[PDB]
Amino acid sequence: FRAFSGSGNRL
Amino acid sequence: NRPNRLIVDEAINEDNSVVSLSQPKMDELQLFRGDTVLLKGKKRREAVCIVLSDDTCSDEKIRMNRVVRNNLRVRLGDVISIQPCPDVKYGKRIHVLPIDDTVEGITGNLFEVYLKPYFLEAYRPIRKGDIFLVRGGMRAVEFKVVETDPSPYCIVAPDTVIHCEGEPIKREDEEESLNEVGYDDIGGCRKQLAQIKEMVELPLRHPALFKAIGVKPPRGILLYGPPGTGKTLIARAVANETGAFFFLINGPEIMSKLAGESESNLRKAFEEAEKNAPAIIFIDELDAIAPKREKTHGEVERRIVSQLLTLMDGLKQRAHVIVMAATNRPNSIDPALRRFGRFDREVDIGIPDATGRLEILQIHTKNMKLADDVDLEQVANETHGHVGADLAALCSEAALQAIRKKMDLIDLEDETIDAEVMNSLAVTMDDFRWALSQSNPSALRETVVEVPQVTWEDIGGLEDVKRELQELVQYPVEHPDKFLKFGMTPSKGVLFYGPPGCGKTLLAKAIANECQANFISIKGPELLTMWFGESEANVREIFDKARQAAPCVLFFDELDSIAKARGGGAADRVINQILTEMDGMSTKKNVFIIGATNRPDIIDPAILRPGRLDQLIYIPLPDEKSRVAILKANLRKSPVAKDVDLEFLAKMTNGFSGADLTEICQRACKLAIRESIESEIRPEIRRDHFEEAMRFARRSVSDNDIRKYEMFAQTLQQSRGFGS
Ligand SMILES: Nc1ncnc2c1ncn2[C@@H]1O[C@H](COP(=O)(O)OP(=O)(O)OP(O)(O)=S)[C@@H](O)[C@H]1O
Ligand SMILES: Nc1ncnc2c1ncn2[C@@H]1O[C@H](COP(=O)(O)OP(=O)(O)OP(O)(O)=S)[C@@H](O)[C@H]1O
Ligand SMILES: [Cl-]
Ligand SMILES: [Mg+2]
Ligand SMILES: [Mg+2]
């Protein structure tokens, strides 16, 4: 596992 | 001591990323409301937060939430350095991971339910490594900031992306849990929690400091109050907030073990506490181990009590250890334990008042989404005789109800959990109303000690009497200096006497309200209920509680009932003991004793002796003008028609008491209600209703009675000689 991978923020 | 150094204090703003200073200090450091400040704590850790103003905050201290406290590895009273942070800019990407023990039960999109509304329109300044808490869906999960693109700190603007992908990280050894109990989990007993904090903070927080001074610190603190009032709760809170080692000793558990094991376990507990000093040993359900010596029949039982007493005496080693103990019944504990050197300090954590209950209700609705129709103040007002645990349970019960009716859908999903839906679960005011009807309150029989909500406004007339009461009760409290210059000590108590239903009880509560002082009412019949043998310890317990609640006004109501019962060997012992307690009551303690009776002809002259209830205040039927005031008072809350004339109503009811007028209002109100039901209308109470009620109205105080009451108003002080 590490750091990032995916998404989010929205808004 | 540069200005940047400040002392940590309790928080008022529930917001995680908010810390507060006083305006004069904010101007000293040259910071303003919008500024983002950098906080440097101990253990070379840092946290970033938004700063705000606080008029209540002392300039030498800084208010920060427990979340911020933990991120700094700091506790209440510690020192931290604050410095401005304009260098903070918006983030590009943020990566937060949940902690296992707080998320293992829920599945789904953790980011949309919690992180979304948490950062939405918030622009929260965060730091790498920080742990923040988000409550929702009847659960509180804490995330740790693993990394931020502008490291180590940045603000969370709408453009910042979030990634929370990954199996929850395990708890680091030094990272204390926020699920653990703290002062913010306690409400309804601010005053008491303060006393304990004072006693315990010094020796537990600064142990070396106390060893150098040579002055004696506390060793034994005894918390008492009905079951479920949060005694066990406070112990745990104080331990965590001070960072002391907490060793719990459960009474029943020790007494469930063999003779040798009980003795052994007590020893180990003390040895372990001394090993990890500073420490708090909490003995829960103390009465299980050390009840009154007369009731402790049995050799093995007697040995354990002695064992405990010896261990308590062994605390003379002064190994920074505090022993706290809890018991429902202070009288149940072996008096040997209340002696100096052992549990020499006691704190009464009684039942919460309206304000307190509200505080509590708010604690257990933190994680639940509450509908708009929910009004906790009503619930608080309604749940009289409820204890902390009762309130905590009903909230759980109101929530469980919202689940039941909404479970129709979940079942088909049971296989898995619906986290997204868990947020959609609201708790209607009906869910509370339902839980209210199903509630089993425990402390209804407990004597209530709180500030009355009855004010002068609720009392019509008696203006000059209200005045005299302020002189007797308020002045000596608010202006002690003046009394000393004149060299007079103020009177101890008062006696209300007059016809029934004229406001004697009302005055007692009103004066208490004006002085924002505690109030304890004990009616005659209550005193005649206590078992004969038990009566002796109960009368004393009352005056003890009065001392605890100083400034306090102790009101003995319905005294006539006891008079009738004497001329009764029980009624005699009681009043004679009250007289004894009155004398022992030092006037300097700010405890005011008031008595009331409808029968000055049979009152014990001993009560009227100088030094006791020597202020004889006569309270007659209300005159014309007063009757109008009373009528308004009762009809304040009710919808009255414009046609109703109260000046005339008062003119016709000359000779009627205050209670009589209230009954007239009720009877007239009942007529208006009847008509509202038969014919579907919004009710109004009009002239016709009062006229009909008045035709059946009757007077409670006869002319013969008046003549007698007027005579006693001039000769009541003469009853200490030969009878009339
Ligand atoms: N003053 C309070 N403020 C907030 N919550 C409270 C308070 N008092 C009780 N509670 C809640 O009700 C529960 C009972 O608290 P307890 O610590 O068990 O009090 P207790 O007096 O030690 O109970 P007994 O005497 O063993 S029955 C706690 O778990 C709290 O959640
Ligand atoms: N001056 C008053 N102003 C408003 N209400 C009054 C007044 N006097 C009496 N009442 C009513 O009478 C009720 C009880 O009055 P109390 O305060 O108990 O007077 P009391 O001298 O103690 O007489 P009793 O024996 O208790 S009825 C109250 O609930 C009121 O509704
Ligand atoms: Cl009497
Ligand atoms: Mg307990
Ligand atoms: Mg009364």
Q: Nearest bound ligand to CA B235? A: 1
Determine the topology of domain B1-88 in CATH.
Answer: Barwin-like endoglucanases (2.40.40)
What CATH number is given for B447-622 in this structure?
Answer: 3.40.50.300
The pair of three-digit structure tokens given for residue B572, joined into one six-digit string: 């005699």
- What sign does the CA torsion over B531, B535, B541, B547 have? positive
- How many Å apart are CA B342 and CA B8, to the nearest integer? 32
Tell me the count of A-B CB pairs closer than 8 A. Answer: 30
Closest CB to A6: pick one of B158, B160, B165. Answer: B165
**Within B181-230, where are the H helices?**
190-205, 207-213
Residue B37 beta carbon below 6 angstroms from any ligand 1 atom: no
B521: amino acid identity, one letter:
S
Considering only CA atoms, which of B243, B334, B242 is closest in space to residue B283?
Answer: B334
**Who contacts B37 (Cβ-Cβ below 8 Å, separation ≥6)?**
B19, B31, B48, B49, B50, B51, B82, B83, B84, B85
**Per-residue burial over B100-137, b = 16 or more CB atoms within 10 Å of its CB, e = otherwise:** eebbeebeeebbebbbbebbeebebbbbbbbbbbbbbb
Which 3 state secondary structure label does DSSP give B611? coil
The pair of three-digit structure tokens given for residue B99, joined into one six-digit string: 């902690």
Give residue B175 CA to ligand 1 midpoint distance, Å: 26
B502 annotated as belonging to a binding site for a ligand? yes
B495: amino acid identity, one letter:
L
Residues of chain B with CATH 3.40.50.300: 180-351, 447-622
Give residue B230 CA to ligand 4 midpoint distance, Å: 7
The H or E element that residue B9 is part of is strand B5-9
* Contact by Cβ (8 Å): B616, B608: yes
Which 3 state secondary structure label does DSSP give B333? strand
Strands B140-148 and B93-98: antiparallel
Determine the topology of domain B180-351 in CATH.
Answer: Rossmann fold (3.40.50)
The H or E element that residue B719 is part of is none
- Return the residue of B nearest to A3 by Cα: B95
Give all strands (DSSP E) within B164-301, no chain letters: 220-224, 245-250, 279-284
Which residue lies with its CA nearest to atom 19 of ligand 2?
B503
Rg (CA), chain B: 31
DSSP state at residue B372: T
Considering only CA atoms, which of B612, B539, B598, B542 is closest in space to residue B571?
Answer: B539
HSE (side-chain half, CA atoms, 13 Å) at B561? 15
Mutate to test the pocket of ligand 1, among B196, B222, B233, B358 (most ligand atoms within 8 A of CB): B233
Q: What are phi and psi of B364, to 5 degrees?
A: -95, 10
B231 annotated as belonging to a binding site for a ligand? yes
DSSP state at residue B474: I
Give residue B305 CA to ligand 4 midpoint distance, Å: 20
Residues of chain B with CATH 2.40.40.20: 1-88
The pair of three-digit structure tokens given for residue B264, joined into one six-digit string: 């052994």
The pair of three-digit structure tokens given for residue B136, joined into one six-digit string: 């929702």
Give residue B577 CA to ligand 3 midpoint distance, Å: 12
- How many Å apart are CA B503 and CA B509, to the nearest integer? 10
Which residue lies with its CA nearest to atom 6 of ligand 2?
B658
- What sign does the CA torsion over B568, B573, B576, B579 have? negative
Q: Do A9 and B111 touch (CB under 8 A)?
A: no
**Within B314-460, where are the H helices?**
354-363, 376-382, 388-413, 419-424, 429-437
Considering only CA atoms, which of B167, B153, B159, B152 is closest in space to residue B93?
Answer: B159
Task: Suggest the residue from A1, A4, A5 to mutate for an interface test with chain B (most B CBs closer than 10 A).
Answer: A4
CA distances to A2, B171, B416 from B165, rounded to whole Å, are 9, 17, 19
- How many Å apart are CA B176 and CA B188, to the nearest integer? 26
Q: Do A7 and B164 touch (CB under 8 A)?
A: no
Ramachandran quadrant class, B170 (left: phi over 0; alpha: psi -120 to 50; beta: rest): beta
**Within B206-258, where are the H helices?**
207-213, 231-242, 251-255
Give residue B186 CA to ligand 4 midpoint distance, Å: 14
CA distances to B245, B377, B422 from B373, rounded to whole Å, are 44, 12, 19
Strands B615-618 and B18-21: unpaired
Which 3 state secondary structure label does DSSP give B117? helix
**Angle at the Cα of B714 from the Cα atoms of B713 and B717, rounded to 5 degrees:** 95
What CATH number is given for B89-171 in this structure?
Answer: 3.10.330.10
Residues of chain B with CATH 1.10.8.60: 352-446, 623-701
Q: Which of residues 1-11 of A touch B (CB under 8 A)?
A: 1, 3-11
Would you tell me which CATH number, out of the four given (3.30.565.60, 1.10.238.10, 1.10.8.60, 3.10.450.30), belongs to the domain B623-701? 1.10.8.60
The pair of three-digit structure tokens given for residue B25, joined into one six-digit string: 């200090």
Residues of chain B with CATH 3.10.330.10: 89-171
- Return the residue of A nearest to B146 by Cα: A3
Q: Does residue B226 have a cis bond before it (omega within 30 degrees)?
A: no
Q: For the CA atoms of B2, B8, B9, B11, what is the dihedral angle to 10 degrees?
A: 110
Q: Do B115 and A7 touch (CB under 8 A)?
A: no
The H or E element that residue B512 is part of is helix B504-514
Let me know how long chain A is.
Answer: 11
Resolution of the structure, angstroms: 3.1
The H or E element that residue B342 is part of is none
- How many Å apart are CA B127 and CA B112, to the nearest integer? 21
- How many Å apart are CA B544 and CA B343, to the nearest integer? 17
The H or E element that residue A8 is part of is none
B232 annotated as belonging to a binding site for a ligand? yes
B202 annotated as belonging to a binding site for a ligand? no
The C-alpha of A2 sits at a distance from chain B's nearest C-alpha, in angstroms, of 9
The C-alpha of A11 sits at a distance from chain B's nearest C-alpha, in angstroms, of 6
The C-alpha of A10 sits at a distance from chain B's nearest C-alpha, in angstroms, of 7
The pair of three-digit structure tokens given for residue B713, joined into one six-digit string: 């108003």
Taking each continuous run of H as one helix and of E as one strand, the counts in chain B are 28, 22
The H or E element that residue B62 is part of is strand B61-64
**Angle at the Cα of B470 from the Cα atoms of B468 and B475, rounded to 5 degrees:** 120
DSSP state at residue A11: -
What CATH number is given for B352-446 in this structure?
Answer: 1.10.8.60
- What sign does the CA torsion over B1, B3, B5, B10 have? positive
Structure-token match 């010094």, residue found: B202
B505 annotated as belonging to a binding site for a ligand? yes
- How many Å apart are CA B291 and CA B283, to the nearest integer? 13
- How many Å apart are CA B375 and CA B219, to the nearest integer? 43
* Contact by Cβ (8 Å): B499, B709: yes
Considering only CA atoms, which of B490, B394, B495 is closest in space to residue B441?
Answer: B394
Q: Name beta bridge partners: B617.
A: B496
Strands B591-597 and B493-497: parallel
B106 touching A, CB under 8 A?
no
B122 touching A, CB under 8 A?
no
Q: Does residue B278 have a cis bond before it (omega within 30 degrees)?
A: yes
Q: Do A4 and B163 touch (CB under 8 A)?
A: yes
B117 touching A, CB under 8 A?
no
- Return the residue of B nearest to A8 by Cα: B162
Structure-token match 């006539």, residue found: B560
B159 touching A, CB under 8 A?
yes
Exposure of B445 by Cβ count < 10 A (0-12 exposed, 13-18 middle, 19+ buried)? exposed
B95 touching A, CB under 8 A?
yes
Ramachandran quadrant class, B570 (left: phi over 0; alpha: psi -120 to 50; beta: rest): alpha
CA distances to B105, B143, B185, B571 from B99, rounded to whole Å, are 12, 6, 21, 64
B123 touching A, CB under 8 A?
no
B350 annotated as belonging to a binding site for a ligand? no
- How many Å apart are CA B604 and CA B606, to the nearest integer? 5
* Contact by Cβ (8 Å): B89, B75: no
Ligand 2 neighbours (beta carbon < 6 A)? B 459-461, 500-506, 596, 598, 630, 633, 658-659, 662
Question: Which atom of ligand 1 is nearest to B233's Cα?
Answer: 17
Residues of B with Cβ-Cβ distance to A8 under 8 angstroms:
111, 115, 161-164
**Who contacts B439 (Cβ-Cβ below 8 Å, separation ≥6)?**
B383, B386, B390, B393, B394, B397
Which residue lies with its CA nearest to atom 20 of ligand 1?
B228
